[PDB]
């Protein structure tokens, strides 16, 4: 029903793009990307190296990007205010370029007359919700707002069910990482953090992740008791959650498998996914889950002490979040 | 003994650095670039994922680079013309950014009072060059010059070697060429090639190549008788050249193995290599010869038709070449 506009036609505006027609939820009718021209992004959007070819029909008509018949207006602004979504009925406006991630650089977008901005990526200071985790707090009277860290959106849902049932004293999360957008493949500049600006091909590069503790802003209950750091691996897609962590009520390992496959076909189904298979990563290209348990992988030491293991695609699952996230606003509008 | 400066210290501008100091032929006094603090140089040479830590001292000494206790200027520079390459001391100054690769933009060098400019990079207008092929015509009115694209330095002394024992009727190059940092790790925007924008991790991707029409320019005798292209592969270093080539006389497979050997051990010494061990790419990490032929892995069909292979350290053959032609240079002032 919402019609909604991205900015940015990134990794994560363009599955976004694909989710919203994948599954109906939304209409996307408005794009702005400065950098890309609009015969340039039938061609990104159409194929993906890792999701493979789109599954429906995408062409350019008069200056009009058309996805399956769906006309949508193209934008080349590279100032956020100037971009007239009103006039393309854009009501909703997803922020993916990850540089206006505050209140008051994603607000540029209501000067063109969006009525509400989602961020796809953590924000300073607006506030911050995870599908099936925190989303019930969501209410009109906020305009501007953040879908988290992919990780986040992978280790608040199955740190929830954990806390709930057995309560995390204090946790550590380690995440290994597929490549993002802001590594390289060889050269060398990368202004703040050295180690990323390290060839991503050739190592294993450590990494931070305000993740852990963004998990204790959803969650208010676990805040400051996880924190964590990652490690950027040259796999293409998918990436793993291991979560250290220390219970205060005792819990065998075959307890915790009941709660999450529980919750899984439950009040976190569609969100939390559960497994007993002997997978591996790329079993998750594609898969929608924000989340998805691995039984097998994950160890014991006693009744108090475990270490979980939950995958996620890093990339097409949040996608799937941030539309169902929309929809869930424009419920309650 | 001739003083240097490097404007840009990318994987090139370092390498050079490298190069400069492992031989000694050249001295560098200068280096210009405005996107990395004096701090991040000492770090971003220090360290290479692929070549390993440097062997010697390196540390930031009162706003100075000191590499084995030779000091530094740095300038943090934009524009090419505000460098103040003269009161440094810098005679000679290697272009190595890869944007100022005309006549006209790398000219801008002179300003701040270099004497000649080096271009790292094949040049639209600016004469090439490529050690022991056509160096020997470089002469003092020449104030900028090029020293060819990484591929051309492997392709042409092979091709020199060739062409004079047999005569090259027509041949068709194609390159596997391991990543450069005008490649991506996923995202998507690439301006103008398309193909280039596409993920480097996952797959092998087809790319424009001038260096067999270049050879053309510095053997003027092979003009418009080779053109190619190139598959970029996710290797960390190390190209190969496959030539397929007609030629005018007959020539058994070991006769050009005969004629490729006497030049590797005689008038193309330390730039032609020449190998019958069951070698692979990898193999060939921090070599410095610009073109290692291959013996055992090309194939003939008939005495006027043969596949030749050639393996290049893209980085390190062509930096050491960088200063070479310098050193070269240098002598004929
Ligand atoms: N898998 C993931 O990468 C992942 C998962 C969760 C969250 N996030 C977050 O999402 C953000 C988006 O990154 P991405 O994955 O799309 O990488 P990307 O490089 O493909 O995305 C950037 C896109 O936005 C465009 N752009 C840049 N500046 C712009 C401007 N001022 N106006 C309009 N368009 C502009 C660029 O041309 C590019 O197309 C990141 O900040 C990241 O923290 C990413
Ligand atoms: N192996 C190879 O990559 C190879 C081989 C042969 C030739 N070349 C050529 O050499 C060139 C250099 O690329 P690289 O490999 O160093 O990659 P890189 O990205 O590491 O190099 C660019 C460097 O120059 C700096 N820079 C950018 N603009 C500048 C400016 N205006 N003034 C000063 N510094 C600036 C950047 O911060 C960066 O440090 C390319 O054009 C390429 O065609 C490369």
New interface residues.
């Given amino acids: 029903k919402v019609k909604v506009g991205v900015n940015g036609?990134?990794?994560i505006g363009?599955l976004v793009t694909r989710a919203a027609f994948n599954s109906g939820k939304v209409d996307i009718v408005a794009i702005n990307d400065p950098?890309?021209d609009l015969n340039?992004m039938v061609?990104?959007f159409q194929?993906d190296?890792?999701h493979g070819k789109f599954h429906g029909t995408v062409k350019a008509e008069n200056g009009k990007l058309v996805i399956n018949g769906n006309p949508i207006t193209i934008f080349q602004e590279r100032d956020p205010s100037k971009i007239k979504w009103g006039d393309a009925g854009a009501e909703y406006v997803v922020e993916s370029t990850g540089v206006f991630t505050t209140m008051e650089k994603a607000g540029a977008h209501l000067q063109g007359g969006a009525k509400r901005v989602i961020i796809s990526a953590p924000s300073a200071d607006a506030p911050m919700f995870v599908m099936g985790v925190n989303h019930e707090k969501y209410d009109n009277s906020l305009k501007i707002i953040s879908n988290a860290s992919c990780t986040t959106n992978c280790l608040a849902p199955l740190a929830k069910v954990i806390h709930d049932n057995f309560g995390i004293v204090e946790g550590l999360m380690t995440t290994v990482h597929a490549?993002?957008?802001t590594?390289?493949?060889?050269?060398?500049?990368s202004?703040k953090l050295?180690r990323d600006?390290?060839?991503?091909?050739?190592?294993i590069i450590p990494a931070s992740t305000g993740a852990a503790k963004a998990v204790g802003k959803v969650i208010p209950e676990l805040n400051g008791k996880l924190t964590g750091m990652a490690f950027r691996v040259?796999?293409?897609?998918v990436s793993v959650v291991d979560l250290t962590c220390r219970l205060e009520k005792p819990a065998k390992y075959d307890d915790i498998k009941k709660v999450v496959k529980q919750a899984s076909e439950g009040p976190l189904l569609g969100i939390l996914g559960y497994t007993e298979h002997q997978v591996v990563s790329s079993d998750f290209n594609s898969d929608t889950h924000s989340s998805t348990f691995d039984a097998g992988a994950g160890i014991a030491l006693n009744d108090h002490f475990v270490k979980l293991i939950s995958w996620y695609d890093n990339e097409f699952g949040y996608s799937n979040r941030v539309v169902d996230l929309m929809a869930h606003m424009a419920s309650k509008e």
Same sequence: chains 1, 2.
């Fill in positions: 036609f990134g990794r363009r950098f890309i340039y061609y990104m194929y190296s890792t490549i993002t957008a590594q390289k493949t060889v050269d060398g500049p202004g050295w600006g390290r060839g991503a091909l050739q190592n040259p796999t293409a897609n």
